């Protein structure tokens, strides 16, 4: 943290944040969600971190080199240390990345380093080649060399993601899944784990072995797992919570904005709210049925509910403000809803679903006051607009994510947030082979467009291809875009170091401080 001149720090440097739900895991290879990443960024530190503006900055690596954006060499800082005093080495990263891509690990982010095209990865992910063939090596204890199968100019931007953080071999092998328990866990971020009470709290405490501990200010941070936005705000107003989750109660926003205007932060956020269709679940294996569902949704009515927060109605997957995106709106997005509804019902009839023989589907969502209200509106809209009957099903975060990977759902509320600020962070999740493809969308044509993005010579051509990717995704009605996110949360006046200027919102507790109050 960089505390300004004049600021008087409080004696008690402690922070309470709502994390929104109970984490899947504290193992960096077993996570895929925002809540999981939030805690992971305090506990483990990779080669690079995000600075306050979201730009990649030195983490364990203090400097780095690249040849032709294909061989990357990272010089690791000599004082990088684990919480048990031992050094963080190149060898740690080799072990960790290998573990990330091992089929036996079953990481939901197994495909993340394949987004960077590390040599050997394709056949390792399929179980045809051993993990030790991965193109990552420890040249010496403090020099990590990564070899890619082709130039990837943005490869370095991936390396801030927690799935690329190092993990402690000895704790994992001694304790298996219990390695992340308070007595067993070994960490290399600014904090370590103090306490973990399921469905109550996770308490982290400052770790003096952290190389940059001298700059850390907060001594203890508590993360809470409260899924109810309304409860989050209530416990904020009564003094328990210092920072809410970035999920507002629709109905309370304007009142908050009127009563405590200086505590309401609203910033750009590179995430898209959508209804993910299970493309492998009949009848949604029919492009006509998916298209009907996409067109029949009234984005204007949904967005109008959160209007005060400034959300924009969505026409695709990749947020239009993503670095490197110059997206086009498809023709259907310029129609009236009436016209959209008429098209949708004709499509349904072509597929054989009529007024007299209507479709009933299940809409899955994760427990949340916001998603519930929006799901009730979505069901009502679909019934009235295109004659589809929609039943709601709610599941807790961890299980919700499980269900979507297992494919035991029809349609699901979903939100995806960039992991690095470049359109492949989104588009690579719809690759046929991706560990993150919960839509179960498989288009050889799409995959082929994405393979072309790394064969072109300049960034303008790459940008034009990302637009071709989105157009293909839309032509296949893989998902039902709803709205582009904003990052809206409550932050107490004495909390310092929250700038909100990173559009991916990768904040670190080590950057905050408590002003005397």
From Swiss-Prot:
Give the PROSITE patterns listed for this entry: SBP_BACTERIAL_5
Query: One GO molecular-function annotation for this sequence?
Result: oligopeptide binding
Q: List the GO terms this entry assigns under cellular component, sorted alphabetically.
A: ATP-binding cassette (ABC) transporter complex, substrate-binding subunit-containing; membrane; outer membrane-bounded periplasmic space
Question: GO biological process annotations for this chain's record?
Answer: chaperone-mediated protein folding; oligopeptide import across plasma membrane; oligopeptide transport; peptide transport; protein transport; response to heat
Localization per record: Periplasm
What positions belong to coiled-coil segments? Answer: none
Grouped into one coarse class, the protein's main location is periplasm
The record, for InterPro entries, names: Peptide/Ni-bd (IPR030678), SBP_5 (IPR039424), SBP_5_CS (IPR023765), SBP_5_dom (IPR000914)
- The organism's superkingdom is given as Bacteria
Q: Does the keyword Transport apply?
A: yes
The record's annotation in NCBIfam families points to: PRK15104.1
Assembly mode = The complex is composed of two ATP-binding proteins (OppD and OppF), two transmembrane proteins (OppB and OppC) and a solute-binding protein (OppA).
Membership in a protein family: Belongs to the bacterial solute-binding protein 5 family.
- Give the protein's recorded name: Periplasmic oligopeptide-binding protein OppA
Task: Please spell out the taxonomic lineage of the organism that makes this protein.
Answer: Bacteria, Pseudomonadati, Pseudomonadota, Gammaproteobacteria, Enterobacterales
């Amino acid at each position: 943290a960089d505390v300004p001149a004049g600021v008087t720090l409080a004696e008690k440097q402690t922070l309470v944040r709502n994390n929104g739900s109970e984490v899947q895991s504290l193992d960096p290879h077993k996570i895929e969600g925002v809540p999981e990443s939030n805690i992971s960024r305090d506990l483990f530190e990779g080669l690079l971190v995000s600075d306050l503006d979201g730009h990649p900055a030195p983490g364990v690596a203090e400097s780095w080199d690249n040849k032709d954006a294909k061989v990357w060499t990272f010089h690791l800082r000599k004082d990088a240390k684990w919480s048990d005093g031992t050094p963080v080495t190149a060898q740690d990263f080799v072990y960790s990345w290998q573990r990330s891509v091992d089929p036996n690990t079953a990481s939901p982010y197994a495909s993340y380093l394949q987004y960077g095209h590390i040599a050997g990865i394709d056949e390792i992910l399929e179980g045809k080649k051993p993990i030790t063939d991965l193109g990552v090596k420890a040249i010496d204890d403090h020099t990590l060399e990564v070899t890619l199968s082709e130039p990837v100019p943005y490869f370095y931007k991936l390396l801030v993601h927690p799935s690329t953080s190092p993990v402690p071999k000895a704790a994992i092998e001694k304790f298996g899944e219990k390695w992340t328990q308070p007595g067993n866990i070994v960490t290399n971020g600014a904090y370590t784990l103090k306490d973990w009470v399921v469905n109550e709290r996770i308490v982290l405490e400052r770790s003096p072995t952290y190389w940059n501990n001298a700059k850390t200010v907060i001594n203890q941070v508590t993360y809470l797992p409260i899924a109810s936005e309304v409860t989050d705000v209530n416990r904020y107003r009564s003094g328990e919570i210092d920072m809410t989750n970035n999920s507002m109660p629709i109905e309370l926003f304007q009142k908050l904005k009127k009563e405590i205007p200086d505590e309401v932060h609203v910033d750009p956020y590179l995430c898209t709210y959508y209804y993910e269709i299970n493309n492998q679940k009949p009848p949604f294996n029919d492009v006509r049925v998916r298209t009907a569902l996409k067109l029949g949704m009234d984005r204007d009515i949904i967005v109008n509910k959160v209007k005060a927060q400034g959300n924009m109605p969505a026409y695709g997957y990749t947020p239009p403000y993503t670095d490197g995106a110059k997206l086009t709106q498809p023709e259907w997005f310029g129609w009236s809803q009436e016209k959209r509804n008429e098209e949708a019902k004709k499509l349904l009839a072509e597929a054989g679903y009529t007024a007299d023989k209507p479709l009933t589907i299940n809409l899955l969502y994760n427990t949340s006051d916001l998603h519930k209200k929006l799901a009730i509106a979505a069901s009502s809209l679909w019934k009235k607009n295109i004659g589809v009957n929609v039943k709601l099903v709610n599941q807790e975060w961890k299980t919700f994510l499980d269900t979507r990977h297992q494919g035991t759902f029809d349609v699901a509320r979903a939100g995806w947030c960039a992991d690095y600020n470049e359109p492949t962070s989104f588009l690579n999740t719809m690759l046929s082979n991706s560990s993150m493809n919960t839509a179960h969308y498989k288009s050889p044509a799409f995959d082929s467009i994405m393979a072309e993005t790394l064969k072109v010579t300049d960034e303008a051509q790459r940008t034009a291809l990302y637009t071709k990717a989105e157009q293909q995704l839309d032509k296949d009605s893989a998902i039902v875009p709803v709205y582009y996110y904003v990052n809206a949360r409550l932050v107490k006046p004495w909390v310092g170091g929250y700038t909100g200027k990173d559009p991916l919102d990768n904040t670190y507790t080590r950057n905050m401080y408590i002003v005397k109050h």
